[PDB]
Design a protein around this ligand. Structure first.
Ligand SMILES: Nc1ncnc2c1ncn2[C@H]1C[C@H](O)[C@@H](COP(=O)(O)OP(=O)(O)OP(=O)(O)O)O1
Ligand SMILES: [Ca+2]
Ligand SMILES: [K+]
Length: 425
DNA sequence: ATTGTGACGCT
DNA sequence: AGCGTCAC
């Protein structure tokens, strides 16, 4: 009743750069704009691996993690841009720098949590209060929400329906109540329209966004209307929305845990979780997961938007699949050097830009025929930004994995160097 | 022969 | 600490 908290205390947005690496390449090369096109890493094995796909190309069935030769079968006019190669591996610097452009604009409007290179959560609660007090009672015009969908409306041409739903929502709004969660979300959506307009004006990049009361709903909302649109998911919209939502679509339930929720409880949709007590869910999935599931099938989640615009780790990884697996000492040392040199370059830039120094080096490897994605993960001290020293230390840390009697066996299928544990500098 | 990231939880 | 999960 009156004491049941409804998770309506915050306004949270999730901003997601539409096919980001593709947009970066389309900005640089106008011949790629408004065409079916994709970004690929490497080129020899089956044309290279596709890692990003424009919406025009998605219409032909082109997806990430598909070989370029196969994508060309689906879409023979597909245009491709290749990731830069430096020191023998893919180098994502162009995309990291573009991401910083976007994140810096978002940070003007509100505090952000960098979730990935192309995704950030936005805490809008204080921004909405400020904008509400600046309104002082006037309603919100549809003209302030030109790309917003209201999930679940209209009820009772795609752009025509978008506007019908928005009109239903806005006519229903009680603007006089400065504490109405639905009003707060709507003002959040106005601010996100402005943020998205600023991103596009100042970078050329388009994005989609979700606006709701927490991060999981904001992420779910963001996915409902792409590309270049934003979606408001109100608390009231959750029962219908969840009633036919596959559990795997909710952030963190797309893996083994979600599969076990489905198998153990015999359900398919998020909304079905409401039938179970909190103790029942904790009994199947643990105290933390159980309480989380109990609240989140009701639209409630408390995970904060962390004030963190920079990555916490700086990592350099390369797979050596099939017959490219590393089999000699000279090879392992040469690739550790290559990785360590990219890492030193990025670390020196990070120290200059962000006033911090990493203090721990994580070295990880995969060994041929090992079922796990990482076979070994050991850490050593990171005391100066020197590629030769880091590569020597990584070798020293992994060298007892060699079971030979100048050869390396079993062959190595992945090397990974990661700088972690930053401290202010 | 999805690769190259990056965040967080468990024990 | 090292390993596992999840997503991007
Ligand atoms: N597995 C991956 N390997 C390499 N890069 C990836 C991988 N997954 C995603 N990315 C890269 C390419 C994307 O441009 C960028 C953002 O990822 P993601 O948001 O999932 O898709 P996207 O931005 O390309 O399209 P959209 O969000 O519009 O559906 O990160
Ligand atoms: Ca994206
Ligand atoms: K993303």
């Amino acid at each position: 009743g009156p004491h049941m908290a409804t998770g309506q205390d915050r306004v949270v947005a999730l901003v997601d750069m539409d096919c980001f690496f593709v947009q970066v390449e389309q900005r640089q090369n106008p011949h790629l704009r408004n065409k079916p096109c994709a970004v690929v890493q490497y080129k020899s094995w089956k044309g290279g691996g596709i890692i990003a796909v424009s919406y025009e190309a998605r219409a032909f069935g082109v997806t990430r993690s598909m070989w370029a030769d196969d994508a060309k079968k689906l879409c023979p006019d597909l245009l491709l841009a290749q990731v830069r190669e430096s020191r023998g591996k893919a180098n994502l610097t162009k995309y990291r720098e573009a991401s910083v452009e976007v994140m810096e604009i978002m940070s003007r409007f509100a505090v952000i949590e960098r979730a990935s290179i192309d995704e950030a959560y936005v805490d809008l609660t204080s921004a909405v209060q400020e904008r509400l007090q600046k309104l002082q009672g006037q309603p919100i015009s549809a003209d302030l929400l030109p790309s917003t969908y209201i999930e679940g409306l209209p009820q009772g041409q795609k752009e025509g329906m978008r506007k019908q739903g928005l009109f239903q929502w806005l006519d229903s709004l009680q603007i006089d109540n400065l504490t109405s969660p639905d009003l707060q979300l709507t003002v959040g959506a106005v601010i996100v329209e402005e943020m998205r307009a600023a991103i596009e004006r100042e970078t050329g990049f388009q994005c989609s966004a979700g606006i709701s009361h927490n991060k999981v709903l904001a992420k779910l909302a963001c996915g409902l209307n792409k590309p270049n649109r934003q979606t408001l998911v109100s608390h009231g919209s959750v029962p219908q929305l969840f009633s036919q939502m596959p559990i795997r679509k909710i952030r963190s339930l797309g893996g083994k845990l979600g599969a076990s929720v489905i198998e153990i409880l015999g359900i398919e949709y998020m909304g079905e979780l409401t039938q179970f007590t909190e103790s029942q869910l904790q009994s199947h999935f643990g105290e933390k997961n159980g309480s989380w599931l109990y609240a989140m099938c009701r639209g409630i989640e408390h995970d904060p938007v962390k004030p963190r615009q920079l990555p916490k780790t700086i990592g350099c990884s390369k797979n050596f699949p099939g017959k490219t697996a590393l089999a000699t000492r000279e090879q392992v040392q040469w690739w550790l050097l290559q990785l360590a040199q990219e890492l030193e370059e990025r670390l020196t830039k990070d120290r200059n830009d962000n006033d911090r120094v990493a203090t721990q080096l994580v070295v990880s490897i995969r060994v041929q025929g090992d079922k796990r994605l990482s076979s070994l993960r050991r850490c050593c001290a990171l005391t100066r930004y020197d590629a030769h020293k880091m590569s020597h230390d990584a070798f020293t840390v992994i060298k007892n994995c060699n079971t030979s009697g100048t050869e390396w066996s079993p062959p190595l299928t992945m090397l990974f160097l990661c700088a972690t544990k930053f401290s202010a500098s």
